[PDB]
């Protein structure tokens, strides 16, 4: 059995220190990582958070959660596949530890993110939720239209995480297992951008107002959702070489999808999901981090001022994309 090796190489597989992997870093980049490599470092974070150990999770348990929830990103979609939740939980990591995230949160908090990262696009079939709904698929008929994708997520996540011998949670009591799931359904939906566009208005002003207080439960979940978005979108902060290569993927997906619409719903995709309007690329990024980004990068740091490196690396890309839209 080919999975079956596998589990027996990664089980056995030193864990490299975190330094050496160097997970701390903002600007870290899996590209030159093998699978096996970015698994090791997946565990790395779990041991990191203390995780491991204020949870009881055995070694052998971990190694095939984190297994089975790479198998299940598919790897013919060109962005929504194991690397982008992988990235995510990257970030998830350094924005606790680099970011001094961590010390705001509890344990139960911390675990449900860093699970929720690893697994909030699983399954992702690398067609947007409007195209779901449009088509009838299955998925939208499921889940009567709402966060379509991101219900199917966490269901693929609570199938992973109920199936045997990848039950990491197990070393929980009834009550904390219940809290985290709720808290990681919570995560996951909140990856939904129309969610995060709904909620924010409310986290940025509650910043500006200097009113921000972390002990009031609304607003820890508020906040929980916001850290979600900030490293769902982290890509958009990294060096030029690895968000012009990252980029370049979520065009890919897009354009994938606009083929799709032509051939299955006869119509002429936007100029985002069209193959012919390319050339756009760079106004439209700019677009995409004005609209979306900037503030939330901007609300983090006011938060910590520690996460600066993520707002600084989001300027200096919006800088790069702005040159190339003249
Ligand atoms: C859903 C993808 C979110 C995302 N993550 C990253 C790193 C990126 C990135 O670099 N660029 C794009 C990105 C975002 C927009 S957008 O802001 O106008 N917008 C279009 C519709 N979508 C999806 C429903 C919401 C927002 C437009 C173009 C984009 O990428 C072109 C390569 N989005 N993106
Ligand atoms: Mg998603
Ligand atoms: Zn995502």
Same mark, same amino acid.
């Given at each position: 059995?080919?999975?079956? &090796? ?29 699978? !096996? ?7 790395? =974070?779990? #041991?990191?958070?203390? !995780?491991?150990?204020?949870?009881? $999770?055995?070694?052998?348990?971990? /190694? ?26 990257? /970030? $998830? ?13 509890? %344990? ?14 699983? %399954? ?17 008929? =499921? ?64 910043? &500006? ?6 002990? %009031? ?9 916001? !850290? ?8 958009? #902060? ?31 995709? #936007? ?12 106004? $439209? ?7 979306? /980004? ?6 983090? #740091? ?9 707002? %600084?690396? /989001?300027?200096?890309? &919006? ?8």
């Amino acid at each position: 059995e080919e999975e079956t &090796r596998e589990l027996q190489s990664l089980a056995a597989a030193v864990v490299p220190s975190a330094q050496t992997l160097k997970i701390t870093d903002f600007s870290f980049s899996d590209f030159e990582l093998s699978d !096996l490599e970015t698994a090791l470092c997946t565990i790395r =974070m779990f #041991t990191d958070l203390n !995780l491991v150990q204020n949870f009881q $999770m055995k070694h052998e348990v971990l /190694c095939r959660w984190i297994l089975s929830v790479k198998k299940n990103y598919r790897k013919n979609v060109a962005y929504h596949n194991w690397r982008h939740a992988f990235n995510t939980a990257q /970030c $998830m990591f350094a924005a606790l530890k680099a970011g001094k995230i961590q010390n705001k949160l509890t %344990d139960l908090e911390i675990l449900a993110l860093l699970i929720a990262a690893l697994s909030h696009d699983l %399954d992702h079939p690398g067609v947007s939720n409007q195209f779901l709904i449009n088509t009838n698929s299955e998925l939208a008929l =499921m889940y009567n239209d709402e966060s379509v994708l991101e219900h199917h997520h966490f269901d693929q996540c609570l199938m992973i995480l109920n199936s045997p011998g990848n039950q990491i949670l197990s070393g929980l009591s009834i009550e904390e297992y219940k809290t985290t799931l709720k808290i990681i359904k919570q995560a996951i939906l909140a990856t939904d951008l129309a969610l995060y566009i709904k909620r924010r208005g409310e986290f940025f002003e509650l910043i &500006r107002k200097n009113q921000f207080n972390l002990e %009031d439960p609304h607003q820890k979940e508020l906040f929980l959702a916001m !850290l979600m978005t900030a490293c769902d979108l982290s890509a958009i #902060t990294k060096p030029w070489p690895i968000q012009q290569r990252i980029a370049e993927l979520v065009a890919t997906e897009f354009f994938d999808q606009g083929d799709r619409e032509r051939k299955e719903l006869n119509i002429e995709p #936007t100029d985002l999901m069209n193959r012919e309007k390319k050339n756009k690329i760079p106004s $439209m990024q700019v677009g995409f981090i004005d609209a979306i /980004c900037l503030q939330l990068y901007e609300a983090l #740091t006011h938060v910590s001022e520690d996460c600066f490196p993520l707002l %600084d690396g /989001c300027r200096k890309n &919006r800088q790069k994309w702005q040159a190339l839209a003249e």
